[model samples]
Target: NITDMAGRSVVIPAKVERILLGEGRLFYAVSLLEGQKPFDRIVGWQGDFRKLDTQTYAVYKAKFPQVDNIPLIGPEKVLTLNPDIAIFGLSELVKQLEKAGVPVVFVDFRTSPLKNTLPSMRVLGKVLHREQQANDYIKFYEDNVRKVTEITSKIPADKKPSVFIELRAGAMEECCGTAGKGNMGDFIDQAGGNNMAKNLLPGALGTVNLEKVLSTNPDIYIASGGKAPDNNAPGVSLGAQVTKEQAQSSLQTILDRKGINTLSAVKNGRSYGIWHNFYNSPYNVLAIQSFAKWFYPQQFADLDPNNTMNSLYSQFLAIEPTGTYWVDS
Candidate 1:
């Protein structure tokens, strides 16, 4: 038998000793919550650890050098792990695991409007017997979210800047954007800015015509998933490998396309670039605050996003990320 945070009842047998993480983000989050010591209990991870952040990858790499030695199992191999509980995101995988005599709990980390992130964390806490730690983390997340929302709610509609997010650019698709219903769009709204693509599209990712983006004429442009360096780019004063100036030059190249030259955001020089994968993880709370500070400088000047981000890293993530991770560029 098991019970959730709200005193809800759940039943399970006593054989659930090992926990198998089937999703990359979930494994990352669990690793953070356990302070990286959970590796002893983690029977297997979903994929290669190098795909994660440098800090997270370092912890697991040092502890479990033979992570690849574990059998590479898909949904059909759910029973092979003999895990009492299998955590996953893909619904199809859940169905397949259930049929194979393994109980599956679906964790929604994908970009969705349902705000299921905190709840899923709570459920994982219950499963791992770390209820207090989970509750404390949830409170920290919700409190920051509420603080950002309350401050931004007072900003008038006219002050809200229309933001254009450039996801990726290829030969066929010059630029892709996110709409109102997904994670990125939600962060934009919470940060007190209006998303230019909200009305035209749905879901997490989509393609936008250059003509439409030009017609909309947003006030701010944010580029993601481009040639931006990893979070560890060096400061300007020091003799660092990459400076913020280099990052800005790269972003300008992305927006300086022939037809995009006339867009209001590009012409006015209001374009910026942030780390692409900031959203859809625990770091999203920081992303919302960062965006708020970026959009409304005068209104949110008292709120120091740099200090706030550092505090979060120290408290929740337990690491003070050195170097400039995000900047005005």
Candidate 2:
């Protein structure tokens, strides 16, 4: 039983009988909180877990078909679950649930402005009665942040490379790339790279013109992988596989565009592609470390990203990830 900052009362069970996780990342946080306790308790998820690359999702899918079989519930369908305590994002539906007699606890894991990842973890832990586990996870996250900050602080300002992050490739109205004062920008800064889009855009996501991108002439261009559909589609739909060859072709297209050939990143072949949302979670701590090693090979000659990821996954995630998760080209 717990009450949130909003004074909403929630009665938790000794063991959660059913849980409806609203965000895919929260499932990862819950796994850390309750260890194996919430595994059986998670009744449904907001998104398809199969789409996620986490080892925990793979483990869960193998052990329980019910995880996949759980019916997809909409806002109206949630009432049917009659959940003891519903844990979900703060939305109008949460208020609706409250009005309908089901206790709702709003988890704002998507609060980008706050950048409060640890507090979100704590909320899940409190709901699941795993405070110690939450504290441990928070400490682990903070330690990694400190490690990256310490390394980045020592980097000479002049040595930092200019980095450009390219978003989608279409749409004149909302397309183009911009990274300003947020996760991607912060990661670039902490990894000893100067974000080219910093101060040019106001928020986490924004639009930048092609002329401006060419003008900045970044020394390194970090492109996102994972393909969906083209413009005019409301939601991302399955599309042709985006292979390394395709990625290179796409980058070449950008380079071949008029007035863009002189960019150092394009000229020197410093273009790289990483996972689309790799810098958004605890897993991103490793991404930052990898970025630092890649951006400053000479300065970080002692660091091996592959070995570091292996160690971190083994220690924290408790499973060895198999296959090529990240590649440098």
Off by over 4 Å in 2: 1-15, 34-38, 48-60, 88-90, 101-114, 154-156, 168-178, 227-262, 315-319
Which candidate leads in lDDT? 1
Per-model TM-score on C-alpha atoms: 0.80, 0.75
lDDT of 1 by residue, 250-280 (tens): 5555666666667788778786666555544
lDDT against the true structure, per candidate, is 0.62, 0.60
- List model 2 lDDT by residue over 1-329, tens digit each: 66553456676555556777665555655666655444566666666344643334555566554666765553777767766556654366677777876666655433241354666667667776678878887776677667566778777889888888764332345446556766567678888889888878777667677678778788887655433323222211111233445455554554554554566776787766555445344455656766676687776776665675565555445334543333344
Candidate 2 positional error at 33, Å: 2.9
Worst 10-residue lDDT window for candidate 2 reads 231-240
- Clash count per candidate: 0, 0
Candidate 2, residue 89: lDDT? 48
Candidate maximizing TM-score = 1
